[PDB]
Design a protein around this ligand. Structure first.
Ligand SMILES: Nc1ncnc2c1ncn2[C@@H]1O[C@H](COP(=O)(O)OP(=O)(O)O)[C@@H](O)[C@H]1O
Lengths: 508, 483, 485, 497
């Protein structure tokens, strides 16, 4: 039977080797992990989501455990750190019994019993919270706390929740519809702002270009309008041959800006109707002030994320060629103004015909701060979306794990009895999350646990670690919470993963 | 973890010796076999093969420090190495890796508000040439030799004081035309874009000129090919000379019939441009780059005002000046025997004028040379015993790291560091802020830094103690990469 | 060599200090001792670990040797001197790495020793002299957490009678107390309560056939070291003894019964084959004198000593008691029982307590222990470090925090963490100057040691601090060990 | 701190080694071990007592855990295998928390915080049984089942209990003074007998020597009586035998008087064949080479006043025995002395076919009757077969964190370290190590029910009504010793050389 011992030993070794790493990852007092991949690139990463993708993985079975943890990550966003480590201690508690001589199928049956005996506790430990703004604010605060410094989480927990209040269509929630995230290197970090509209990449270049255009329709284009010294040899291989050739290109822009004048004499016979133009490529240096003498905002260097949000939110009908300069190919933008801050210009399009697409504009002094706060923002809005579609929101910070372990050890030998060791091996491996949460913040792993392992009411009390003191703290009145499906799919997937790994003997 | 901060310690140690006005210069024989005997930390950091990834955060923080004041790089490296060196003592005491982070953050936030409370700022303006020449003394005093700064502060200032106008400034306009030959005393000042030329047919008092633009430089059947090439280069220099150019430029060498053509139409045959002025001459006269001799027009043309020959620096050179600013460009001419000191003189010039740029927007000047550092080292260590808890350790390990900065100023000057640190810390208790470390005395003697005039920018220290602490914190919060 | 082998000296000192660092305090972790034969010893006392250990390095040999000199003058604390010297020598290398000389380091250490000896006397609480409640509290402080805890009800009396029976009024009032003159007789048999005190010296020997005018109500003693014979054919010098007429003359050799009768003819009683620890205490209890040269044989021959000789068969043994003596400085303490492992510990800890009550006869001061005196001298020396300038400022402060391992090891080997406990201890010690709080050795909690009661005497901790400092400066005095390899 | 981890690792390994050595030898279904000397001698052993002595030790620290273990065996008789395995498992339960990063003083405190309540549970779980014959019988049966077969235990359970009823005095119950182990290599193992008196070494070598001696008065002697310029030299030695026979006849006509007054004599050396006939012509039993263990039993039980020479053949230098008969069995004879005057020294006659299995049953009888001597000296009796140990686990797990709190981990470590007795009892008896444990760990009453393991089915069986019992001074002494031994090995540091 040493054959099965070989596979059991190598799987135990791999799932310890991941368990220690992802134990160090978890927690708001956790440490970042820096990943270098060949070209000397530096990525400061705390979340296990990017860590399980980009890791040049040492071990064969660890690749499978990382792939299935990513398959769990597809629905939860975070908690996957806790997912793969609760696996790596679940089969550790199994290894405590297969070394005693038990069959692995006994421990799989115990996991199967304890899965239902934990989910029956999970369905009643929750509370069907109404979707008040503050009951989402504290969820955003908890999901933002484990990523960045906690005061920055208290800053951006207002900018997350109103962006999530801007989604209110009860047919389908998706974050990739409307939340666009851009960055401003203002050498400041606390001013990540939600703007109810499309924030563009840049702004009005000319000084005589108008700072303020209220009732704006938009001329979109993609192809060139600049005085284009072409990227092939513009001086082509006398002098008169090109004296009017690129000047014929100039005239091709002269009658074009005459056509632009014609289009703004189609609708803009009144001056209250202002206008903005955007080309995705460059603006001609004489058309720059030629529209600045007309007072129409012009801009280059647009991204396609800006174009698709001009079409979807601003109602902009897209344009490719200049033959169709017609009033139906416009949009609607009741607030267009450039906003130069730091060193770069930035136009803001808002008050569009259907305000749906928003912008969580990130202020950041360095690149790693803004990427960490971007992952913080995205995981927070994902967690609060998972708190939206779940009608209930469970307490957090390890309270439900202690209460579930206090449920499962009170689950008697009503179970098979031979499979009682499976229940007792499932229960103690639930306590590792309040173990390593208090452990990651300098407190005692054992003393804080046994302080929480004294149920502070007649019930197994919803009491988690405090990440600043290491004291038994009720997570209800502090609102340190999380949604339901994170730990639900956590327990389900981790049970099926453990019963998958526990039944392997020989590999070739 | 300990290997990361050990890499940070050796990264601090390789630049600690090059700190201050007596920095020991290092030799760079690089990948493409240069030869630099240099002292600036950003030059060595851009040459060193920084292979360990944890030190790359320190290098990037020093690069961000360079990107906004231009100086204070070695200060960031020394202070970050000191913070990590005391952080490993804090860890081996038994403190967590979390506690040192917020301890360093609290003490850095305390330093950020104590630092504006020791300032002896600038007097009235960045004009009044002889006043701000003394203000620019400390920057090149740190970099180049001190006995050389007395001419060099004037030469670096009288050119940069041309346009301290209307609340805006650019450092790119201050250039160097590096001309070899005579000594450093023979260096002089020029007003406009200057480089050497070859020929002589220059129209001098031009109007708003018409400048040629180059992005790329240069029996009877044989005689017929000769006449064909003859009228070929004639039509070429006419293709520049049509639309009325006053100069004809080239990055390369002369041609005999072409120079006779440039004398026939009376055009200045400009020669020998560098591989860097091809953008810079285009920037100053409004010129657009043209490859060959055939495709200029009047629209494809630059516009200087006065192009003639100058003989300052004992050599014939060109002058481009009186642009839209009418005094935008103002190069300097730096004269040396060899090149291996001239790169250090050049890298002292721009590191003086960026301090002039930060003096345009920050007139606050702190006493430098141990004065500010020992003051912060006393203030934060007096704050350290006030707040109890574990942070009482870390704050007290913060200010002690400040004492590593004059120690690096001490041991680079042949001075016993413990004696001069104890003496400076004692005299700072009563003989307050403006005293610091004297350089010239072999005896560990202190000296007041205000009357010595050795003062630094306040914003440079303010950004440097932010970036070094951010680098130390973001290094301390990693564990490893599989490597 | 030089500072390199000076760092080698202090490394050999620290590696023998930090071996026996853990075994101070009432929760001392044991150690494993293994000879190269397979034998296994498990120990707690640091001096027993210091005995069988070998060390190749001579600096550590001298370091252990001076603590061995400390071991038999007041008693225990020989581990604490080795411990406290080690961290001072360890922090000395941080300034030896600053390229400063050992001389400035040891002068800062001596200047700190001069503050250590004074600030301990500042926090010294006076105990009262010979008051039975506090004399019992000496036994509750310095004798407890040993194997006397079931027999301290005897030791509290055996302390106080012995300290009043080993005194010496040489230059003043009874000031020198001594460990060697309290006539200890540790013979088993009977219950342990039969161990009681008496004034005098007891003798295991008797004359082999005691037909002698033996016990007199004022035995005056002359000592002799020769062997007695039949007669002149010494009875000639025995006849010369009769000029002064003492009633005993003490020998060390055997006397026949006819020579016993001829000693009765002068009426002097001798003794045979006695011990030296019997002989010096016989001389100490009575103040006798020795002479046999006839021109020196004068009125200065006879030492008028005791008031009772007594042949007595206490427990079928040939006992002879010399009691009601001249001097109450060699007085009897019998020690009865079954085996001889705990009343020996009573004798050890009560000779250490005899030096304690000797200090009580000099300066009856009890200072709160458990690191409370250590934290007090640490804070009082750090505040004195703040005003001083010069290069000696850092080493003088260094022993201010090098010596605080007496709480720090004690908070180590009790389960609790050291960082937050020491931080909270100094947090209520710097601004709370007048408290003298010590870490409790049981639960690892910062208590008031004056409320806990465990007060170490002043002079013993002064001796340990002084010996630690003169260990450190002696080790730093050494430059090289060159006489060979 | 790596030195402490190294010393603890090299100690937990050795105490695991002793655990794996003395695990399988506990229980009735256990396996013997083969003690092999350097001279090829073979010893089969079940009990860990002499297993711990002659074990050629392989590890330095493993000697120390041996040395205290037999120190338990002086004051417990049997079950030192249980002591060393509960030590080796208490050490592993502490290692499961020290390797987590806990200080060993905390588990040291948690050991005593559970040990005092374990003693509190032990002083109330016992029953103060009176000294009935049947409770001593089942104590002997329990102590003998783990050494010999249960049928052979049913053989010895009467022959032990009657001798221990024969040591019943006012206040001197003593094993070695009066109970000896006599062994006869005769063809049947079920024939161990209690003998009120003494068995001597040989019997009558002559048919004229009688077999019935009523008023037996026993004479001892040490010098042989055998036939031991040269034709008269050995004849002069023969005449020294002759007047010796005449002195025998002098005593034969000196102390006899009537024919009721019997005479018997042994010798520590040989008896001459003509002297054998001369003692046989008067019917007086002679004996060559009785053992020296028989001399003091002739004094203390048979009242035989010892003699060496023949000049002092006196009436008062004799014993008073009511029965002397020689008994040929197998090949050799044995003289039987019964109805002694103060008959105290008794004789256990073990019969059997072999020698080394007879030494095995001799050590079995020794362990069993020492156990029942402890059961008499104890004023109570306790349940056995791991019932009280499961009850101790049921106590100490439910004995709350009212203790220090972080030492509650040490309390639970002691609690689940007290469960290796029924675990290896079920393991040695071929059942499951966990199934019948949690079957026993389903308390049949609301209290922790005194449920031992059945060593034949794997059934949770109440040990109270079946009398599978032990004395108090075995588990009380293991609770007293094991805790302080394990915490002596916990608080160790490293090693000199
Ligand atoms: N002559 C001097 N006397 C005292 N201090 C000086 C002198 N020259 C330079 N320093 C000090 O050296 C410090 C470091 O300057 P340095 O790091 O060399 O500038 P950079 O970063 O441009 O190389 C400055 O803060 C300055 O106070």
């Amino acid at each position: 039977v040493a054959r099965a011992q070989a596979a059991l030993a190598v799987n135990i070794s791999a799932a310890r080797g991941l368990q220690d790493v992802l134990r160090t990852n978890l927690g708001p007092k956790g440490t970042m992990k820096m990943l270098v991949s060949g070209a000397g690139d530096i990525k400061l990463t705390k979340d296990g989501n990017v860590l399980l993708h980009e890791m040049q993985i040492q071990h064969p079975t660890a690749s499978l455990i990382a792939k299935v943890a990513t398959a769990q990550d597809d629905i939860t966003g975070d908690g996957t750190t806790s997912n793969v480590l609760i696996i790596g201690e679940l089969l550790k508690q199994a290894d405590l019994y297969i070394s005693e001589g038990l069959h692995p199928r006994i421990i799989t049956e115990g996991f199967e019993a304890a899965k239902e005996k934990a989910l029956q506790f999970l369905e009643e430990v929750k509370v069907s919270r109404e979707m008040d703004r503050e009951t989402l604010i504290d969820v955003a605060r908890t999901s933002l706390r484990t990523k960045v410094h906690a005061e920055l989480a208290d800053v951006l927990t207002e900018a997350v929740v109103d962006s999530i209040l801007a989604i209110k269509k009860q047919d389908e929630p998706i974050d990739l519809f409307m939340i666009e995230i851009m960055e401003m290197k203002h050498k400041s970090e606390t001013d990540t702002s939600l703007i109810r509209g499309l924030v563009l990449d840049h702004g009005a270049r000319h000084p005589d270009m108008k700072k303020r255009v209220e009732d704006a329709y938009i001329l979109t284009c993609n192809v060139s309008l600049e005085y284009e010294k072409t990227e092939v040899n513009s001086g082509f291989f006398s002098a008169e041959e090109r004296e009017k050739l690129v000047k014929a290109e100039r005239k091709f822009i002269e009658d074009r800006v005459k056509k632009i004048i014609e289009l703004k004499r189609k609708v803009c016979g009144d001056s209250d109707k202002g206008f903005v133009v955007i080309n995705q490529k460059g603006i001609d240096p004489f058309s720059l002030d030629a529209l600045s003498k007309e007072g129409i905002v012009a801009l280059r260097r647009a991204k396609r994320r800006n174009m698709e949000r001009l079409t979807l939110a601003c109602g902009g009908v897209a344009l490719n060629s200049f033959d169709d300069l017609s009033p139906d190919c416009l949009g609607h933008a009741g607030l267009v103004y450039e906003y130069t801050l730091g060193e770069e210009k930035f136009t803001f399009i808002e008050k569009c015909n259907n305000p749906r697409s928003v912008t969580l504009l990130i202020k950041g002094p360095n690149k790693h701060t803004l990427t960490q706060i971007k992952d913080a923002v995205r995981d927070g809005l994902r967690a609060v979306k998972n708190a939206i579609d779940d009608g209930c929101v469970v307490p957090g910070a390890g309270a439900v794990e202690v209460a579930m372990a206090e449920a499962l050890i009170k689950h008697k030998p009503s179970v098979k009895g031979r499979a009682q060791l499976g229940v007792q091996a499932f229960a103690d491996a639930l306590l590792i999350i309040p173990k390593v949460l208090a452990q990651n913040s300098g407190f005692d792993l054992q003393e804080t646990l046994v302080k929480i392992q004294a149920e502070h009411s007649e019930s197994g009390q919803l009491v988690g670690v405090d990440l600043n003191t290491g004291e038994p703290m009720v997570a209800a009145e502090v609102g340190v919470w999380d949604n339901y499906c994170v730990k639900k799919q956590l327990l389900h997937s981790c049970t099926v993963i453990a019963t998958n790994i526990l039944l392997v003997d020989e590999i070739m | 973890v300990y290997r990361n901060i050990q890499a940070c310690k050796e990264l601090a140690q390789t630049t600690r010796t090059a700190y201050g006005p007596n920095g020991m210069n290092k030799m760079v024989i690089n990948h493409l076999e240069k030869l630099f005997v240099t002292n600036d930390a950003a030059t060595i950091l851009r040459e060193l093969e920084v292979q360990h990834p944890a030190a790359k955060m320190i290098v990037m923080a020093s690069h961000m420090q360079e990107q906004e004041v231009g100086d204070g790089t070695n200060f960031v490296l020394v202070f970050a190495g000191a913070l990590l060196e005391l952080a490993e003592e804090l860890l081996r005491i038994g403190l967590s890796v979390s506690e040192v982070i917020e301890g360093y953050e609290i003490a850095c936030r305390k330093a950020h508000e104590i630092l504006p409370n020791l300032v002896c700022c600038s007097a009235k303006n960045l004009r009044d040439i002889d006043e701000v020449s003394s203000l620019l003394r400390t920057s090149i005093m740190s970099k180049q030799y001190g006995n050389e700064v007395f001419l060099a502060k004037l030469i670096a200032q009288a050119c940069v004081s041309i346009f301290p106008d209307s609340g805006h400034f650019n450092v790119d306009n201050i250039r160097v035309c590096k001309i070899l030959g005579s000594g450093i005393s023979s260096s002089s000042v020029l007003h406009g874009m200057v480089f050497k030329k070859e020929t002589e047919g220059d129209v001098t008092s031009v109007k708003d000129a018409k400048i040629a633009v180059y992005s790329c430089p240069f029996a009877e059947e044989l005689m017929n090919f000769s006449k064909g090439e003859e009228n070929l280069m004639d039509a070429q220099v006419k293709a520049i000379a049509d639309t009325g150019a006053n100069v004809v430029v080239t990055g390369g060498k002369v041609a005999d019939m072409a120079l006779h053509y440039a004398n026939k139409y009376n055009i200045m045959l400009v020669r020998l441009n560098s591989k860097w002025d091809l953008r810079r001459l285009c920037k100053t006269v409004g010129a657009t780059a043209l490859p060959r001799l055939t495709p200029p027009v009047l629209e494809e043309m630059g516009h200087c005002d006065s192009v003639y020959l100058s003989e300052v620096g004992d050599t014939q050179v060109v002058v481009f000046k009186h642009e839209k600013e009418d005094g935008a460009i103002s190069t300097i001419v730096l004269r040396g025997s060899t090149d291996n000191l001239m790169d250090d003189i050049e890298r002292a010039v721009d590191d003086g004028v960026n301090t002039f740029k930060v003096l345009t927007r920050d007139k606050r000047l702190v006493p430098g040379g141990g004065a500010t550092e020992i003051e912060l080292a006393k203030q934060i260590t007096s704050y350290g015993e006030t707040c109890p808890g574990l942070e009482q350790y870390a704050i007290k390990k913060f200010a002690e790291a400040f004492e590593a900065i004059p120690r690096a100023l001490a041991e680079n000057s042949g001075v016993k560091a413990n004696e001069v640190i104890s003496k400076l810390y004692a005299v700072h208790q009563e003989g307050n802020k403006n005293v610091g470390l004297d350089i010239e005395a072999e005896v560990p003697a202190v000296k007041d830094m205000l009357e010595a005039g050795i003062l630094d920018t306040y914003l440079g220290k303010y950004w440097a103690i932010k970036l070094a602490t951010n680098a130390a914190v973001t290094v301390l919060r990693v564990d490893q990469i599989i490597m | 060599s030089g500072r390199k082998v000076q760092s080698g000296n202090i490394n050999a000192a620290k590696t023998i200090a930090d071996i026996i660092r853990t075994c101070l305090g009432p929760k001392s972790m044991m150690k494993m001792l293994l000879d190269p034969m397979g034998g296994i010893v498990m120990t707690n006392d640091g001096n027993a670990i210091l005995r069988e250990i070998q060390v190749q390095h001579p600096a550590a040999k001298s370091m252990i040797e001076i603590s061995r000199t400390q071991d038999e003058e007041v008693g225990d604390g020989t581990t604490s001197v080795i411990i406290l010297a080690g961290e001072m020598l360890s922090v000395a290398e941080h300034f030896l790495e600053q390229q400063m000389h050992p001389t400035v380091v040891i002068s800062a250490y001596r200047k700190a020793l001069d503050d250590m000896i004074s600030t301990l006397k500042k926090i010294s609480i006076p105990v009262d002299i010979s008051d039975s409640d506090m004399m019992l509290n000496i036994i509750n402080s310095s004798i407890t957490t040993k194997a006397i805890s079931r027999w301290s009800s005897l030791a509290c009396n055996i302390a106080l009678d012995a300290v009043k029976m080993v005194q010496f009024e040489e230059n003043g009032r009874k000031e020198i107390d001594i460990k060697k003159y309290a006539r200890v007789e540790k013979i088993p048999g009977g219950i342990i309560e039969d161990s009681c005190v008496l004034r005098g010296v007891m003798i295991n020997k008797d004359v082999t056939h005691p037909r002698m005018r033996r016990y007199i109500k004022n035995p005056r003693i002359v000592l002799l070291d020769s062997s007695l014979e039949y007669k002149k054919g010494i009875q000639q010098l025995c006849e010369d003894i009769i000029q002064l007429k003492p009633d005993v003359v003490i020998t060390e050799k055997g006397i026949s019964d006819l020579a016993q009768h001829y000693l009765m003819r002068a009426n002097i009683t001798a003794i045979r084959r006695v011990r030296k620890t019997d002989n010096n205490r016989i001389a100490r209890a009575c103040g006798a004198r020795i002479v046999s040269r006839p021109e020196e044989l004068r009125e200065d021959d006879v030492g008028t000593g005791a008031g009772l000789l007594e042949i007595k068969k206490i427990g079928d043994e040939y006992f002879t008691f010399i009691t009601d003596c001249k001097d109450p400085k060699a007085c009897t303490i019998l020690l009865r029982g079954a085996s001889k492992e705990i009343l020996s510990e009573v004798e050890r800890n009560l000779q250490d307590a005899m030096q304690v009550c000797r200090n009580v006869l000099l300066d009856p001061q009890l200072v709160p222990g458990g690191g409370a005196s250590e934290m007090a001298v640490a804070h009082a020396l750090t505040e004195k470090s703040k005003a001083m300038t010069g290069v000696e400022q850092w080493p003088y402060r260094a022993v201010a925090q090098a010596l605080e391992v007496i709480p720090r090891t004690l908070i180590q080997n009790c389960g609790a963490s050291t960082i937050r406990l020491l931080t909270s201890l100094r947090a209520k010690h710097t601004q709370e100057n007048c408290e003298t709080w010590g870490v409790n050795g049981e639960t690892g909690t910062l208590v008031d040691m004056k409320e806990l009661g465990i007060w170490e005497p002043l002079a013993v901790k002064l001796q340990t601090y002084k010996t630690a400092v003169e260990t450190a400066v002696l080790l730093l005095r050494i430059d090289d060990i060159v006489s060979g390899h």
